[PDB]
Amino acid sequence: SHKEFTKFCYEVYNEIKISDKEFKEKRAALDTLRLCLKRISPDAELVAFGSLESGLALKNSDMDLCVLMDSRVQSDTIALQFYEELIAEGFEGKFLQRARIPIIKLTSDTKNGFGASFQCDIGFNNRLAIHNTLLLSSYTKLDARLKPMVLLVKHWAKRKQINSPYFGTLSSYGYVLMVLYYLIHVIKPPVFPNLLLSPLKQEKIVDGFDVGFDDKLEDIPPSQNYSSLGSLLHGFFRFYAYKFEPREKVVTFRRPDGYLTKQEKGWTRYILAIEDPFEISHNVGRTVSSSGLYRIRGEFMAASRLLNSRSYPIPYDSLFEEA
């Protein structure tokens, strides 16, 4: 059935999703950040990526931005100039550079009214993250069940303390990929086609990687999977609880059947392996430790057991209780 669980899912979804109010405030912040950039480099463009751009944002969302500019202009000079403008305008944060890659991390706004803990990361020519986001945005448009499913999974992972890439567990983006992999390559009939593997897909090379996918969404037939959101979620928890084999297999968007061994990849950290769909040399699960994977799997199992419980009423609330 999952009738009651589905009703519960939409209730939680409406409480955890970003409000129209906060979204418009984030849009206003972006606009002011663009003004600051304009004063520094009229040719540069400031674009948003990640959760806010894909529509997969929870309340109190962080902001991810990328400055696009002529690749012959050195990014550290404009980054520093942009950073110094932002400080002058009352933002607080840090300027840093990992290897060749400059980053601005803003952590407050003391004047412009976007909050004392306004959080915004600014990259420079991070074109791949823009493309990653375009893919996720396209899936979010293709089926209305994706958005609440993703938000609920993110909320679950946060509550269970398994959404901490610095402490041996998995990024939110990792969980999004786990959801998409399930919906494309596991569930039958599929909720989604694989857009990278479409016969209509046109190669597009960006920073050495093929970011091409079929984005002509209007011609794509609607799903023939009619599962409720509650049922989708239960299948998801079950697959990663009992069926997926993290020791051997890679979550992948590059095989027609979704099948890829860690051995073929040479991904023998590789404790949990999730091949980024465009940047295929990147394991999104590289933050996951042995103990971290144990808890992740344990929580997948506990979620599955809850939804499979025959002790009525099922305490669905415990799904989002702090572990």
List the main descriptive attributes of the protein structure presented here.
poly(A) RNA polymerase activity; monomer; cytoplasm; globular; five-stranded mixed sheet; Beta Polymerase, domain 2; Poly(a)-polymerase, middle domain; alpha+beta; 7 strands
Percent of residues in β-strands: 5-15%
Question: How many separate helices?
Answer: 10
| Intertermini distance | 27 Å
Q: Helix and strand string, N-terminal first?
A: HHEHEHEEEHHHEEHHH
Radius of gyration: 21 Å
DSSP strand tally: 7
CATH architecture of the largest domain: Orthogonal Bundle
Q: Shape from CA axes?
A: globular
**What's the number of domains?**
2
Q: Tell me the strand order in the biggest sheet.
A: 1-2-5-4-3
What's the helical proportion of residues?
40-55%
Here the CATH topology of the largest domain equals Poly(a)-polymerase, middle domain
Which class of secondary structure composition applies to the elements?
alpha+beta
Biggest pleated-sheet summary? 5 strands, mixed
Question: How would you explain this protein's 3D organization?
Answer:
The protein is an alpha+beta fold and 323 residues long. It folds into 2 domains: 1-17 and 143-323, Poly(a)-polymerase, middle domain, CATH 1.10.1410.10; 18-142, Beta Polymerase, domain 2, CATH 3.30.460.10. It is 41% helix and 11% strand. It is built from 10 helices and 7 strands. The protein has helices at residues 3-16, 20-38, 51-54, 75-88, 127-142, 146-159, 172-186, 229-243, 262-265, 290-308; strands at residues 45-49, 63-68, 91-98, 101-109, 120-124, 205-206, 209-210. The chain has a 5-stranded mixed sheet, with helices on both faces. The chain has a two-stranded antiparallel ribbon with strand order 6-7. α1 (3-16) packs across α6, α6 packs across α7 and α8 (229-243) packs across α10 (290-308). The longest helix has 19 residues, at 20-38. The radius of gyration is 21 Å and the shape is globular.
